[PDB]
Amino acid sequence: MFYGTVSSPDSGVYEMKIGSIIFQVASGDITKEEADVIVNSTSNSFNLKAGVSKAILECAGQNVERECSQQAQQRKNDYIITGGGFLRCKNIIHVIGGNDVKSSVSSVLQECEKKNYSSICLPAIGTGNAKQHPDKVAEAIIDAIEDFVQKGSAQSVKKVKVVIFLPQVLDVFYANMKKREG
Numbered sequence: 412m413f414y415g416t417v418s419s420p421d422s423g424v425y426e427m428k429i430g431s432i433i434f435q436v437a438s439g440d441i442t443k444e445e446a447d448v449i450v451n452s453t454s455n456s457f458n459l460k461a462g463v464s465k466a467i468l469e470c471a472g473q474n475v476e477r478e479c480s481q482q483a484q485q486r487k488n489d490y491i492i493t494g495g496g497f498l499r500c501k502n503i504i505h506v507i508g509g510n511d512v513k514s515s516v517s518s519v520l521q522e523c524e525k526k527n528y529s530s531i532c533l534p535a536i537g538t539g540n541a542k543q544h545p546d547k548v549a550e551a552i553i554d555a556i557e558d559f560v561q562k563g564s565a566q567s568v569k570k571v572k573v574v575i576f577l578p579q580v581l582d583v584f585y586a587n588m589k590k591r592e593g
């Protein structure tokens with residue numbers, strides 16, 4: 412009821428519509444992206460600095476690191492929202508890589524609608540330090556977007572892009588998009 416056709420609008424970028432949302436995947440360095448929200452995949456202490464999290468916390472800067480540890484010591488959080496620091500975004504949403512990936516992506520979408528944001532960029536959440544399997548992660552990310560659209564929740568959100576560190580993981584995402592296409 413929701414999926415469009417898979418195509419390539421730019422070299423190495425693959426896209427398809429899911430309802431009103433353009434869903435894109437590409438390999439590369441997420442810290443060079445511009446979007447309303449960039450997602451970080453981190454530990455339950457919000458202070459991992461290994462893999463994608465290292466790149467994100469180093470580029471964002473020390474004020475963002477301090478925002479993370481301050482919120483961490485205030486309550487038990489499933490995720491936290493900070494400033495963008497020196498990343499090209501309005502906010503970073505830091506999710507726990509070991510948590511249910513569908514749940515994490517649902518929360519990111521909801522928070523973006525609350526702020527009337529249009530664009531999101533995320534990594535292949537949980538495939539690094541958390542060692543979740545790449546096709547289970549791809550299935551969960553795309554399932555969350557489908558559910559959000561099915562419920563009529565997409566209003567401000569128009570683009571969701573996964574920027575993936577390993578080309579081998581990109582290949583898994585592309586196969587999952589082809590499975591779903593109209």
Ligand SMILES: COCC(=O)Nc1ccc(O)cc1
Binds near residue numbers: 461462463508535540
């Ligand atoms: C979240 O799990 C994937 C991950 O850590 N990816 C990753 C990103 C950048 C980098 O420089 C090394 C690795």
Ligand SMILES: [Cl-]
Binds near residue numbers: 452453537539540542
């Ligand atoms: Cl992770």
Ligand SMILES: [Cl-]
Binds near residue numbers: 534
């Ligand atoms: Cl990644």
